[PDB]
Symmetry: D2
Subunit: 499 residues, 4 copies
Amino acid sequence: NRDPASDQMKHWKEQRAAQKPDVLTTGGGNPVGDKLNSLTVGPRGPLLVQDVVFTDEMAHFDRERIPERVVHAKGAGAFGYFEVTHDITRYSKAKVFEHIGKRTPIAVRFSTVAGESGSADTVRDPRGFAVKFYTEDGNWDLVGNNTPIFFIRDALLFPSFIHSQKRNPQTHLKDPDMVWDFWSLRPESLHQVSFLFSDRGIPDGHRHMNGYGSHTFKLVNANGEAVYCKFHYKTDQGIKNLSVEDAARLAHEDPDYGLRDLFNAIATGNYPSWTLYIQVMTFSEAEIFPFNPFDLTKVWPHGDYPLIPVGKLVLNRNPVNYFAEVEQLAFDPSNMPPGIEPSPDKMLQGRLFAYPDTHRHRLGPNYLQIPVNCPYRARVANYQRDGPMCMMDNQGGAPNYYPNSFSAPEHQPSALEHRTHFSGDVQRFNSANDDNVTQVRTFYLKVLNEEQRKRLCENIAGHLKDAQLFIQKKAVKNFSDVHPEYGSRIQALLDKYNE
Amino acid sequence: NRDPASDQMKHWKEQRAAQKPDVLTTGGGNPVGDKLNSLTVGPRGPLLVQDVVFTDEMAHFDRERIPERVVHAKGAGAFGYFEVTHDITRYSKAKVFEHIGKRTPIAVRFSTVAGESGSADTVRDPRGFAVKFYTEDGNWDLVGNNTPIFFIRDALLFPSFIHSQKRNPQTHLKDPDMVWDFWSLRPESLHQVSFLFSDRGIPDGHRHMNGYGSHTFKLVNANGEAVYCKFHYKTDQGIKNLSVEDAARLAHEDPDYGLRDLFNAIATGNYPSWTLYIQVMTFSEAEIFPFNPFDLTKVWPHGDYPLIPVGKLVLNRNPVNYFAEVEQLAFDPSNMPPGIEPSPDKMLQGRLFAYPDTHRHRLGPNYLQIPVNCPYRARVANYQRDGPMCMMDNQGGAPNYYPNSFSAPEHQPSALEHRTHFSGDVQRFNSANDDNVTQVRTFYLKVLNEEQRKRLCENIAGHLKDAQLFIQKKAVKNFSDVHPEYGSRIQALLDKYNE
Amino acid sequence: NRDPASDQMKHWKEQRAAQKPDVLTTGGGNPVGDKLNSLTVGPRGPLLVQDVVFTDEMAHFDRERIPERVVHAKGAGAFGYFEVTHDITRYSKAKVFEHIGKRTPIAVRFSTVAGESGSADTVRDPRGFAVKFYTEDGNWDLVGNNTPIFFIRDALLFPSFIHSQKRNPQTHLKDPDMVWDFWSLRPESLHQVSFLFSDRGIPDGHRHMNGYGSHTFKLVNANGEAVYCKFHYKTDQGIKNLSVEDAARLAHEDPDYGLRDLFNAIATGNYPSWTLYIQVMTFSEAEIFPFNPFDLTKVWPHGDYPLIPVGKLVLNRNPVNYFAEVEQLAFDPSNMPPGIEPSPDKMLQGRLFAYPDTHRHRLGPNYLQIPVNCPYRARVANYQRDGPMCMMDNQGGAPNYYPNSFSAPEHQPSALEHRTHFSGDVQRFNSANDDNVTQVRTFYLKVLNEEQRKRLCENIAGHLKDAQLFIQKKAVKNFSDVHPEYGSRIQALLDKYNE
Amino acid sequence: NRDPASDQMKHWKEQRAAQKPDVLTTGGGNPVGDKLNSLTVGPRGPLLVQDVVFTDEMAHFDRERIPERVVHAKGAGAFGYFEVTHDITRYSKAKVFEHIGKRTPIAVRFSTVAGESGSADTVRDPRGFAVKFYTEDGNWDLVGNNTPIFFIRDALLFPSFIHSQKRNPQTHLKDPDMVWDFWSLRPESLHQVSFLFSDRGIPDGHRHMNGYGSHTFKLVNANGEAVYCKFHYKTDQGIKNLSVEDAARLAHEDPDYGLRDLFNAIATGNYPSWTLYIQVMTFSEAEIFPFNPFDLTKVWPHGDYPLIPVGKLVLNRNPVNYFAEVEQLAFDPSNMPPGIEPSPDKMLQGRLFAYPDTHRHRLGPNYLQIPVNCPYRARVANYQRDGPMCMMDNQGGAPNYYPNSFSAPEHQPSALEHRTHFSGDVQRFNSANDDNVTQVRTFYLKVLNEEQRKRLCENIAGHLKDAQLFIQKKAVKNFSDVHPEYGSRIQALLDKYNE
Ligand code: HEM
Ligand SMILES: [N]
Ligand SMILES: [N]
Ligand SMILES: [N]
Ligand SMILES: [N]
C-alpha cells in the first residue's frame, strides 16, 4: 500500500465493493451499448452522424476546459470549519463571531501566483490563502496571502505588475528585464520584495505558512461603533520553508508537492490548523499612525498593535472532485456580512470590483449558483433573475421588482453600512512617494538575522543578475536607499555574477 | 377577479399568507440595508465602488439575456404526463411503452418559427410542438411540428430556408423576394407551402392543433425486429383555426395569445390532451413505397398505413418560472432511448447533430444539467467531466477513463443499435427532383374543398404579390405543375393585385 | 418600382452587373462541390461525419444568435456626421468642438425600450437615440433618449423598473399590476409617465423626435474651468407623432415601420438631421437651483437656461449589414473625451458601469475591436492584452507593463479630469422624496393644452384600468398630488372602464 | 548583449528610433491623464465608480484568459513557407502541389500533450507538429505528431485515454494506476508506447524531430483517380533527443526550453526545415495489405511503400505576439482542399468533428475570422452569417440563402469529393484485437538496437513501478506478448523496484 492520494481509485473501488457498476449512459441518460467502438458502415467504412454516443461524449470532452484564474492559477483546496475561541463582539457584530465555540463551515484554496495551471508548487512566489466562511449572514470571503503586505499600493498598477511577473508578450518566456524594470521603477515594492526573497519565499507546502488578510479592514459592533483591523491566521504546525535547492528538485520530481502534501495530511487525520487573530486600530489611532494605515505596503507593528485571539481554522475534509469543488471555487473580497467592511485601502477598493467581475467571465454570470460558491447557510432572496445556466427555480414566480405590494423580499436597515465622513478633492492623488523604505529597513535589520540576510541577498542577486545593467543599477540604488549594506551586499554578488 | 394569468402576483402573495417577507440579500447571501438608495459621498456626491450591493445587482441585470433559439424563438411551455393506453410492444421495446397504464412525465414547448422573442403568436407559420419524455432509459425528445411534412428534404438547405424566411441582411426587414425566390427555386416545398397557406397555417392557440414527429423513425422490439414508423399526436380539443382577420387583430391586441390561452386553460383545470398514434411500415413495404419513404416532403397515406393508438399526452402543470423551465428548455432529436431509432431521412440525420450543437452554444456545454433538461428519471453515469458551470458533484471521484479495473460504469449490450444494411457509393445524391407535385395534387384536390382552395390561393397571392414579377411567374409555374387551376387561380389574383 | 428597402437584393444584383458569382466555400476557404445535397452511402443511406461542408455550415447557423440588448432590444441604425456650426470652446475643449465646420463621423441607433427583438416599432415607449462620435480623442458616446428626463433618480431602482416594464416571471405576459404597482409606489416617475402617455409617447418613426442627453454633464475648457450642461438635439424634420389608432394598425401591418422609414429616407437622399444645442449652468447656479440639478426627473427651465447652438447631426448612410453594424453597436456613456465629463447624477453614475459591463457579456470582452465599435479616428495604445477573439496584432511585442523603461505608451497630464470638491458622510441618502410633483404640474398645465390633457388621461386610464383597484387608487392619488384635476379626470375614466 | 529572446524588449525599444511614445488611452481611445493613481475623494478616501480608466483596464485584465487547449496545451509556434521541390501531380491535384517552386505560406505549432499551459517542455510525451498551409483553395491543416502512429485506433477511446494521461479527478495528481490500467487493458497501445518510452520520447527541442500526418489520407488527381497516402516530414536538422537526466534538469532549469530554442534559432537566421515526403498505396494494395491500412497503430513498411519527395517546410518568422498568433492558432484536420481527402481511419473520422467543435468553444463561433486562422490566400464566400464577435462586414448585403436568383456565390462541381463504394451493416465493429503485437515486435527487435532496448525497458519500468502490482502484471503480460524478452527485462526491473 502507498499514500492515500495514490490509492484514490483503489479506495473508491473498495468503498463500493459488492455493488454492481452503474449502467454507462449518454448525457441525456440513454444507456450505451458499446462505448468502445464507433458506429460505421462496415468494419472499414466511414463514421456516421447517427453515432450520437460519440458526438455526445466527444462534444463534452471538447468543452472540458474553462479559463484558468488570471492570477493564482495553480492551487490546492480543502474544507473544514472555523471555530470561535475568543470573544471579539466588542469590535464586530458579525454572526460568524457571535459566541465562543460557534462553528462555521469554511472552504480554503492555497496557490502560487504567476505560474499557469501546469506550473510547479515549490517555486519562489507569494502564496494565496483564501478562506470562504459560509455564514448565516451570507458568505464572507477572506481572500488573503501568506504575507501581511503587497508589492504595490494602488490597483491601477496591478495589471502591469502581474504582466511583468508573467510571460513576455512575444517570446512567451519569463523575462527578468520585465520583472526588475517594474520593481526598480516602483520602489514601493521593496518591502514585499524583501519578504518574497527571504526564506518565507518558498513555504514547505501550504500547511507551514501563515495567512493574512493583508489589507486594513473595518469592524462594526452592535452599537454602531467601528474600528479598523488586520486579520492574521498563524499556522499551528509551525513555519517551515524549503531550501532553494530542495525546491528546485521538487519542482521537477513533484510539481504538485503542495497538492499531495495537503491531501495526505487530511487523509491521514493530520488536520492542519491556524489560529485567527486581529489587530485593532481605533479611528483616532489611524489618524496618527506613522504611515498611511491603509497603505498595503505597510504592516502594523505588533508592539503597538498586539494580536487579539479570535478562533481556529481547521481543514478536515478533502475535495471529492477537484474541478467542481476547487477549480470552480470563487472568492470575492466584496462578500462581507454585516459587522465587517472595507477600509479606504486603494488596493482593497479595486478588489471589491475585480473578483466578482473576473468570476462572471471565468465561471459564468451565475457562478454563485455553483454548489461550492452558494451561500448555503443563508437564504438568498432578491430581485435578480435569469442569466445563462440558470439553476434551481430562479426564485419561481416571486414578484421581480422592488418595491412592490406583493410581499416579496425586503431590505433590513440593521444591515446598513457604517457611516464614515469623507472630505476632499476628487482627484488622482500620487501615492508613489509614501515612504518606501522605513519598514523595509526594520525588516532587513531587525526582523531578519545575519544568516537570512545573506540568503536574501543571494536570492535577489541570483535573479536580478539576468536583467540589463542599467536595471541592476536602479534596483541596487533602491536597495541602498533601504540600507547601504543591503544594496552593497547585492552589488558585490552582482559584480561576481557579471563575471 | 380576472383570468388566472392576470392574477399571478395576487395569487403568489395570497399563497404567502401571513408569512413574513424574506430578507433581501446580495447574490452572496449578505443582507441588504437599503436597496433603493446608492452609496455616495454626500447627498449630491459621486457613486462609490464600495457600493457592492449596486454592482452585484446591476452586474446580474447586465447578464440576464441569453441568445434566443435560432428558430422557434417565440413560444410557450407546460408540463404533464404521457400514459400508455395500448400495447405496441410488438413494435418497440422502449420502456416508455412498457405497459398499459404506464405514466411518464413530459415537458412540452409550443412555438412559431421565424419570429423573434418579441413577435406575435397569431401569425401564419408552422408551429413547433416538442415533447420531452423523462424515461427510465433517459430522455426521449420527440421534437415535432403541427405538420407531418416540411418544406425541404435535405439539411444542407435548412440554413438557407430559415434565412429566406427571416430578415433581409441589410434592411432587417421581412423580404417577400427572399421568401418566394427560395420557394420558387425549390419546388419540393409545394406540399408544406400548400399546408401553410391553408386554414391550418394559423391555429387557434396551441391546444387546437395536431402534433407530428414528421420524420419516419425506426422502432425495434425485444426480438431485434425493426419496422419504420410515423408519430402522430392528435388534439383531443379538436382542430380550430383563426381567420386571417382575427389573427391580424390578435397580433396587436395580444401578441401573446397562445401563451395566455395555454396558461389559463391549465390554471382553470381545462387540461389539454392529445392522443398519440403511430403508422407502421415494414422494411419490405418501404422498399416498394411509391416515393422515398424517408422523404420529409411526403406523408404515408392512412388508407395504406392506418393509425395505431398508443397513448395520451396531458398537460396539467404550468411552469413556475418561465425563463428557467421554458426558455432554457432543450430538446434533442438525438435523445432516443433503446427501442426508438432514426431512419435514413437526410433531414432527420442532420437534426441529430444540430440541436445538441446549438444547445451547447445557446445554453452552455453543461445544458443537460439545467433542471428542466436533466434526465431525472434515469441515472446519468459516464466518463464525461468538467466543463463550465459544472453542477452537482461532477460524478465525484469515480474513475474517469473506460475501460478501467475499478468498477466504474459499464456499457450495456442490450442497448446496442439495430443492424441495418446499406450499400452504395459515398456521394451527394441529388434529391431535388424527387416528385414534388403528386401528393400536393392530392392535398389540393382531395384534402381541401372548394372554399378552402379559394382561401388557399387568396392567402398565397396576398403574400406572393409583393415579390418581383419574375419570381411570381416561376412561383405560379410550380403551382401549375401541381394543377393547372392551382396556378391559374393564383395568377388571376396576382393580376388583380398588380393592378 | 417599389421602395428602395424592398429592392435591396435587386440593387445588389444590379450592382454586381456582368460580374459572375464568386465560388461558394466553407468557412476555411475550401471550395464546395455541391452545397445542396448531403454526403451519404447510397441515395437512401446514412449521413456521414465526413460531410464537413454540412457540419461547417450548420455549426455556424447554430451559433448565429447573441443575447439581445437587455433593454432597447428593438432598433434601427444609420451613419453620418456631426458638423460644428457654433463656437462653444469657452465651455468645452473637446476636440470634437474644436472649430466651426469641423466634421466628425457618427453612428446612431434608435430604439424602443421594453419590447424584444421581434416586437413592433410603433408602440408607446420611450425611444433610445444613441450617438457615437468617432473623435480624435477617442469615441464619445452620447447615449440619449427622446425625452429629457427619466422615471427614476437612483440606479438601484433601474433593474426593478425594467422588470416591471417587461414580462411576468411566471406567465411571460405583460403585467399591468407590475407596471402600475411600481409606478404608484415610486411617485418620482410622474414626470416621465406624463410625457410617456402624452402624444410624444409614440413618435412617427425616428426622424420626427428630439434627442436628449437627459443627464446633466460637465464641460471643461482649456483653462481648466468647468460648467454643467445638458445636451439637446432637436429634429430638423419637426416633431410628429402617431395617433393611438394608427400606431396600433402599424403594429401588425408593419412592426418594422421605424426601420423601413429610416432606411428609405436615407436611400432616397432625404437625409434626416438634428440641431445640437446645450444648456449651461455654472457651479454657482447649481448650488442655487430650486431642485437637485443632478436629478434626472427634472429639466432645466429654458427661460433661465437658454438653448445654445453647437452643431448639426446628419444621417446620410444606411448600414450595409445590419447584424455587423447595428446589432453589434455598443454605446458606453463612460466613453467621454477630454473636455466632457460626468456629473454627480446618481443615474448617470450607475450607467458609467453598466454599459461596458453588459457589452462584455452581450458581445464579448474584446467588443471594442468590432469594427463599428472601434475608435478608428484615434490611436488605441495601452497595456491591455489578450482576451477571447483577440483581433489585429494585440499591440504586437510592445512592453505590456507600465511604467517601463522601453518607450511604450505614456499617459498625458493634459487629459487629467477636472478636480471638484466633495464633502459629507458616506451613506445611502434617500432621494425618494426630492419633489415629485412641482415640474409635473407645469408640464400638465403649461406644456400641454386642453385637448392634449384629454388624451393624456385617456391613454393613462386605458392602461391603468387593467391593474387591481388598490393599485388604481394609489396611482390616482399620485396624479391628484400633481393636480386634483389630473387625478379626477383619470378616475372618471377608470370608473367608466371598471364598468 | 544576450540571446535574442532575452533582448526582446531592448530590441523593440531601439527599433522605434527616437520616436515619441504613443499616447496611452482607454480601450475606447480616450487619452489617459494618470494611469498610476486611482480617482478617490481625498488622499485617503474611497475609490469612485467615476474612475472609468481603472474599470476599463481592470475589466479587460479580468478577461485576458481563455480556456487552454483540452490537449497539447503547452506549445510554441512559428511561421514560414512550404515549397514544392518535386512533381506529385499524378497523385494529387491540390493547388498546393501545382508546380515545382510553388510556395505556400505556413503556420506551425509544436507542443507536448498531457501537461497544462504552465508545464515543462522537456518531458516524456508525444509531440504535436501541426502545419497550416494557406492555399488558394482555402487552408489545409496537416495536424500531425512526431510519431507515425498513435495509442488507439477508435476515437471513442480518445477522451478516456487523455483522461488517463492527465490528473486524477479527486487529487488532481498524475496517476500511474490510471495511466497503466488503461494501457494494460488496451494493448493496441503497445506500438506507440514502445516509441514513446524509447529515446524518441524526449526530443531535443522542436527542430530535432520528424513530423507525421500519421493517418492514411486520400489523394485525388485531375483525372479523378485516387490513391491512399501517408505524409512524412523529416527534420533537416537531424534527429536529436535529450537524456532522461538532462530533460529532468531542464524541466526545472528552463520549463520553456522548446519555446526559447525555436525562437532563438529563427532570430539568429538558423531557420529549421523539414523535407515532406508521401507514401502511396493503391486501392488495390489496400485490399490486400496484411493489416488494416487505416489502423492508426500501424505503419506502412518503407520497403513496400517508399518515401516520395514532395517539398520543403521552412520556418523563418517568429510570432510578434504569442497570444494572438500562437495561443489562438486553430488547426482543423477537416480543412482539406480539393485533391486531399480523408480515409476511413476511425480516428481521423472522429477528428473531422472534434477540432472545429472545440475551437468554437475555446476561441469562439467565428474563430476562423481571427487573423492567424483566416484563409487569407483564399476568397471566403458563402451563406454563413452573424455569430458573436462578427468581424469584417459579415459579407455585407449579399443574398444570404442558396439557391437564389441574385448572383450570390455558387458551388463548383469540380470540387466534388472522390466517390468510394461501401457495403456493410451500420454497426459498432470491434477493432480492439486487430493485431496488437506484430509490428511492435519488429520495432523492438529490428528497429531498435540493444542499447536503446535497454533504455526502453528502464524508462517503462521506471514509470510502471508506481502502479499497483496487478496492473504491473497485466502490463508485463502484454509486453511479453510482443516478445518474451520484452516483458522479461521489464519484470526484472520491476522486481528490483518493488524491493
Ligand atoms: C441607471 C440607469 C440606467 C442603466 C443602469 C441603464 C442600462 C442599460 C443597459 C444595460 C442597456 C443595454 C446596452 C447594450 O446591451 O448595448 C441600455 C441601453 C440603452 N439605454 Fe440605458 N440605462 C439606464 C438609463 C438610461 C437613460 C436615462 C437613458 C437615456 C438618457 C438610456 C438610454 C439607453 C439607450 C439609448 C440604450 C440603447 C443603446 C443602443 O442603441 O445600443 N438608458 N441601458
Ligand atoms: N492577486
Ligand atoms: N426547425
Ligand atoms: N436604458
Ligand atoms: N490529440
